Design a binder for this molecule. Sequence first.
Ligand SMILES: O=C(O)[C@@](O)(COP(=O)(O)O)[C@H](O)[C@H](O)COP(=O)(O)O
Ligand SMILES: O=C(O)[C@@](O)(COP(=O)(O)O)[C@H](O)[C@H](O)COP(=O)(O)O
Ligand SMILES: [Mg+2]
Ligand SMILES: [Mg+2]
Ligand SMILES: [Mg+2]
Lengths: 154, 133, 441, 440
Amino acid sequence: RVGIYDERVWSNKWDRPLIGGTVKPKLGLSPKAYSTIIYECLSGGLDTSKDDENMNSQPFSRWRDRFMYAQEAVDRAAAETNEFKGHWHNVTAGSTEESLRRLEYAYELGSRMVMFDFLTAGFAASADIFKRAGELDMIVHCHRAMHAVFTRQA
Amino acid sequence: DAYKAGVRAYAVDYYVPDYIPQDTDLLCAFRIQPRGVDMIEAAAAVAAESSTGTWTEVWSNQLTDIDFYKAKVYAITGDIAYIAYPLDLFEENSVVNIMSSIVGNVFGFKAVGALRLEDMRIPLALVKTFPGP
Amino acid sequence: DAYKAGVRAYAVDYYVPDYIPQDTDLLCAFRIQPRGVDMIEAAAAVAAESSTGTWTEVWSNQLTDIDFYKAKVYAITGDIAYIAYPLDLFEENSVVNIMSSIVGNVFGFKAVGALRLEDMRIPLALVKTFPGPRVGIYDERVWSNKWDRPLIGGTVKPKLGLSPKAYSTIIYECLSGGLDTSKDDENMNSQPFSRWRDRFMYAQEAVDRAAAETNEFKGHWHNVTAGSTEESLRRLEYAYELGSRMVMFDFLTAGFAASADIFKRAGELDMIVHCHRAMHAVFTRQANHGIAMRVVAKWLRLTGGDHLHTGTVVGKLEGSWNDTLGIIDILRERYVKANLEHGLYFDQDFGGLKASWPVASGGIHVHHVPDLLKIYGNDAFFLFGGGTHGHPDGSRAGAIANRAAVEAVSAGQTLQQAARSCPELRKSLELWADVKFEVVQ
Amino acid sequence: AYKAGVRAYAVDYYVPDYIPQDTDLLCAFRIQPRGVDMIEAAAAVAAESSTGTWTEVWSNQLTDIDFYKAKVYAITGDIAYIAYPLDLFEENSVVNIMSSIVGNVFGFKAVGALRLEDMRIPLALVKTFPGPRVGIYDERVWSNKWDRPLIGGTVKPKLGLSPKAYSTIIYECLSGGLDTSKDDENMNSQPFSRWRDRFMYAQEAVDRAAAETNEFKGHWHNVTAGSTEESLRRLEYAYELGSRMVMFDFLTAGFAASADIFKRAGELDMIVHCHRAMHAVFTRQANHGIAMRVVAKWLRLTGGDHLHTGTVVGKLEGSWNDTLGIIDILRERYVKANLEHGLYFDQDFGGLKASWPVASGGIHVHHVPDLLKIYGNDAFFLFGGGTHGHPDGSRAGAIANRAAVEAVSAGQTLQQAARSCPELRKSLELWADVKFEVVQ
Ligand SMILES: O=C(O)[C@@](O)(COP(=O)(O)O)[C@H](O)[C@H](O)COP(=O)(O)O
Ligand SMILES: O=C(O)[C@@](O)(COP(=O)(O)O)[C@H](O)[C@H](O)COP(=O)(O)O
Ligand SMILES: [Mg+2]
Ligand SMILES: [Mg+2]
Ligand SMILES: [Mg+2]
């Protein structure tokens, strides 16, 4: 839907690589702590931040808390830098229906982008996720988790 | 100031041969072919990079209790590494989430030339969240 | 021909003192008053008629493995019967199903003159099927930016009879004056004197005004309790579209099933649900018959209430000190250890589910704050209804006093210290100095 | 007129000169005062269930407290009679009635025990409720069964049966002569019996047994579930299988969910059988709680088609004269006050349909004469153990229970009937010595 050129247009960023970063530690961070890191790293100069591929919804970080707090940080950091900022909320979930649900919430928070583990969820769910994101004018960042299980050995 | 920046071996914090697995842990049996590091180090990288860790120590590790959430290599018998994952690391009712952690990035690490997940003990408390047939 | 028709004693197959409870069993502690049969027989009937058995042997018992599915009286200590239920007996994610078996028919048996469920060990594998609270304690502190102190609220009074506009005037004054939240009375729903759309809308404008004017987060727990789950959802959604971040629900009078739909929807709508325990004393209060409140507390937290009334101890409503401490821990902690001094018969794992706010309410005033803080600490709500609107100078001044009292004690100072700088609080201290209630440990 | 501070509740809420009105909702409370005289304790109940609190609030001047307040208008010994103005109640909501009348007053330190014995729901409020969809008469019409009790039975063991085994028992007992069978109240959906399997297999059995007997047959599928939405789902599936009836644990699920379930079932032309699981937690002891008679009024108004009422003679507690009052509450248009039957007030039901009383629990063939004496024809008698506990199986047990009810219902005695029916002779022999206490 979006691709390279239109994202440069949406974000007004040209003639350089875009810079991002995964929040760490991979798991175990409260949604509020998560937002504090997202704030610090986007304010420091990152173009985007992202959930880890295995951050979905868990007892330590339920997806609605993390998404909401993360997008607050994005917007606080964008306004204070006068620069487009984004965080790739991970909508990967145990079913296509639930992934679409998480995508819809990210859209309503104002997010222009999400993250999706397209191989672990699968190409069938990916097709539906891409189609809805394109209707919601959103970027879908695709994480290739699991690929090395069959792409590694020659 | 528990924060010691820089790179350490994964085994410092992820190799715990004294760890006693609990009925709520998700257990994995991994067959490992190490490449350029110890068998213990190879196992500990698989454990770290499928739970809480990354390649260098992060200040943000002090914002949570790593020792609680981290995966633990509790046994190594030959080239089989037994790793335990706390229940809290997993989304309920989601094989997809299990995949994303256990087989998400660790099979492409340079420090392992080959990796095979042989088996997994899905704890009963996580089984009950699934519908089955 | 394993089928021996006719009546046998329940104990033949349900009294198993050698049984070793398993981590997956649901355990119950029952206080039994036998009537016309042995203590063992009484326990075995409770076990049988809440699991697999009936009054006479049925041929159909051979169609399944009774020894696997049957409940087991594995211990009897005095008049306390410990009974274990296999996990397979329960529907996942359903307190309603737990109720239907454990407290469904056994309290009306002729062979027991009195029965009281004291506690229940819900096994972790069944806990994990429940959602628990959406917001809970920590995230509500984040939403409202209120830390290191109890939060303070208060029921609008009089209970019934106030018009919607008069209600919002009281809400504005007590919020502006220092209360963090205000609430509908549990029996304010939609009545001729206050139809619910009128009350909801005026109350939320008072809320928004107070918050802007004070530069503090404020809220009002709109009561969405109604005669119908559908109607309750309609009132929750209206509260949402008004911009409310919170409502209340009489979860026991409406019912656990309804409560489940309501928590689910509130959670999708990013709203707090304050849970009022109206009706509970109909079965939680008498020590020899009924369901202990701690059990209700477990069921409420799993189902997903964000707040739960747990008593004052020192106010107008009955409640024991140590009993209240055990209920507090059940709602706030991850793992609770058995402690019979707090009425906890089993260790209870809550499996990472969010915590619920304990709520202290009913007949309390400024003088009770030191005790209430010793009981609850900071992670709780103290509600002052008459204690706010009973102030000689009105609701705003009562709020000033209560807020000044709670901030002071919570920081280490005394009501007497705080009173030096606050006249509103001196009047509250003076008015109710000799108003005390029975205190039981 | 605002005087701050604590005043006694009786100053404003003890009004022995008050004349109850036909619009007032009236309550009879049995009170055990604690640290206060009976009058103060009854005044506290009235205030804290209507307009009052523990201290005088300035906002009392913003409305008409004398108009909206409850009034303790009479005291007879340990019974306080309290009148509540109609305007205090939301229309068509038992939930609201409970919120006021039993909300908080049962936990006050100023009473050691409190029992709601009866409540007079004014006709103006009664007329806002739908009452049952089907009721007694139309069910006799739907099933073409007249001039006798209907006979049913719970499948046993309570839990642990495969859905297929379940269907085998339902087949045998309905074919043997039962009018209806039912899930146990705690059979919802479990690892041993998922609801879709059991419902589907159970309704197959119903239809096979109906066709082979040329008689209407039914099984009460239990749609009780952890949420109203899921219960509605199970109700919809039972409807699509062709079932004309379901079962619902109305108190454990709750009156809010019950209202939605009754409304959908009435749109789907289905009977809802209401199981009162949990009731004895607060209806048992005379000291404290809510009398079952009040629960019966609430259930009938909300729209339950059947309601378990006790056996008196079976394994569960229940006094004869009390059960007669509950029965009249469920079946009659106008109940007359009668303290021998525990009825403190006349109750008008405003032409709402009647609910079937349901006798169930620990009863067998020998109990049938007493049962009909208590209930007469318009009732269900339910034999669970008394059917599947037959020496020869569920079919023979149903044969016996059907013949014992048919016989007594006609005028014959058990032994007259028994001489023709050997299955009944075996039931009589097996359970001749099985008796429970009987309190009148
Ligand atoms: O109706 C009332 O009495 C209250 O509004 C208290 O008013 P005041 O503040 O004026 O007392 C609360 O609902 C009760 O505290 C409930 O009891 P509990 O908290 O025990 O459930
Ligand atoms: O679970 C039971 O015990 C029953 O199936 C009886 O089975 P049996 O026929 O085998 O005894 C009924 O649900 C109870 O009678 C309900 O009690 P009540 O009608 O008093 O509410
Ligand atoms: Mg990653
Ligand atoms: Mg109240
Ligand atoms: Mg039953």
